[PDB]
Ligand binder design. Sequence first.
Ligand SMILES: Cc1nc(C)c(-c2ccnc(N/C=N\O)n2)s1
Length: 290
Amino acid sequence: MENFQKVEKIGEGTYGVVYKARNKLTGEVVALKKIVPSTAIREISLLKELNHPNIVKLLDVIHTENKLYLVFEFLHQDLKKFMDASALTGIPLPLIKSYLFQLLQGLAFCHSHRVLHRDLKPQNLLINTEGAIKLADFGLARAFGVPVRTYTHEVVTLWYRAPEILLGCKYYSTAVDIWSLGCIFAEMVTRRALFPGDSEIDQLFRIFRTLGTPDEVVWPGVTSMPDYKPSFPKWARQDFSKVVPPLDEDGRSLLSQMLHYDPNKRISAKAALAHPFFQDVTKPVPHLRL
Ligand SMILES: Cc1nc(C)c(-c2ccnc(N/C=N\O)n2)s1
């Protein structure tokens, strides 16, 4: 731990602040996240062996006097920022399409080894001047979870949370990740969050008012879920043409499938890569201001 010299604060996570750190030894620049039991360790240690070009590498795990340290490779920017930096113009489609392609490539990899992220948001997606984007804090939800607030004495984000999770399902699959990504995808195209809910019920209803209130017809077993309430308002499904304009039909189709209520009907990572939308996929370069 005394092998790193803090430089600045890359930000604050839901369970620990992130710092950019100089590696006294190698002298390499790394992302250091401070955070305990043994089960977690065995788990987060297992993540070290998991590596993919689009999965932000967990270089080394460091546990000292009940003070956990995650050492990650460093990337200079996250999508949340890059987006704020492109709100006026907007990310070019070719970059959106590639960013989604690579993201699923990664998702496909993790899910393949049955590793869910549970909490994908732009802020956990990192990019480099070379045109690549990677997933960060992946598989960390399994190790621990989330309090009532956060370490930073605040509150997380529900905006990208799937409905099964919002409805009480305690045994959710990889499908939840596809939902989050699909939301992100939509944000990239419109430059505004899809379901910016400010509470679980707001989150749910906001989702209801766009895709209609679910039921056994489109989501078999939906009424038997823990937090499902028969008294839910019955909204009608809005036209997707009004949701992600001006995205083309290939996009709307692909998105529609990433947002199917029924998790098992929801499109998978491996499958999304073969969807017509990636017929003309390339690898543009971003224009980050460092
Ligand atoms: C929240 C974050 N979680 C991780 C793992 C982050 C991260 C990872 C790599 N590089 C960076 N740096 C971003 N800007 O300087 N941030 S930011």
